[model samples]
Target: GGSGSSVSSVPTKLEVVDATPTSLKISWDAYYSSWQNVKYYRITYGETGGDSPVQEFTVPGYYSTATISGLKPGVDYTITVYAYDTFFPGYEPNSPISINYRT
Candidate 1:
């Protein structure tokens, strides 16, 4: 079944900031046009880009903060983030934002 509503635009102003040795923070700004509300934020990270991330976090809409832990110090990792709207069912992941960090 399809909702028949097209996605006019995706959430923007996405960014990665406040990184540390053991953890990092992901944040974004969302705009819901025509009542298509944002549901949650999705974050994925790993040593390599193509495969599954070593860690993933699903953050609620109200809280615009998520911390990634259990990371190896001094190792570089890449992160991808997205905003999903409840109106659109599937993984309507936003444009992947990448970040490389070393502890």
Candidate 2:
């Protein structure tokens, strides 16, 4: 059984936590004030100019950060973060945040 609560807060303040010639560590902020059904934070990224395929990763709800490695140096990438609820999957309304960075 499930309470069917799928409400969650969107991640914001997307920023680069750390980076190197071929890697990037990103972070964001999120808060669940009431229904805390978020189970994971989904991170999706790709080259800004469509030069690379989209890639994704996930972190536990308690996490607000993630890192990506093996990137092409000097390539511009668009990264997005969103909350994933345990009871509802896929993109959520106003729950995704994005940023552009060069790696």
Best by lDDT: 2
Model 1, 1-103: lDDT tens digits are 2488665544435455667787766665433222246576677888755354577777776666567777777777776666677655555654555556555
Residue 59 of model 1, lDDT score: 77
As a TM-score, model 2 comes out at 0.73
- Model 1, position 4, has a per-residue lDDT of 82
State the displacement of the C-alpha of residue 95, model 1, in Å, after optimal TM-score superposition.
1.9
Please provide TM-scores, in order, for all candidate models, with all chains considered together: 0.61, 0.73
How many backbone clashes does every candidate have? 0, 1
- Which residue runs of candidate 2 sit more than 4 Å off their true CA positions? 1-12, 30-37, 89-91
lDDT of 2 by residue, 1-103 (tens): 3488576655346778799999899876534323366787878889997867999888898776789887889988888877767645455747577878887
Show model 1 residue runs off by greater than 4 Å: 1-17, 29-36, 49-53
Model 2 residue-pair collision total = 1
Local lDDT at 90 for model 2: 50
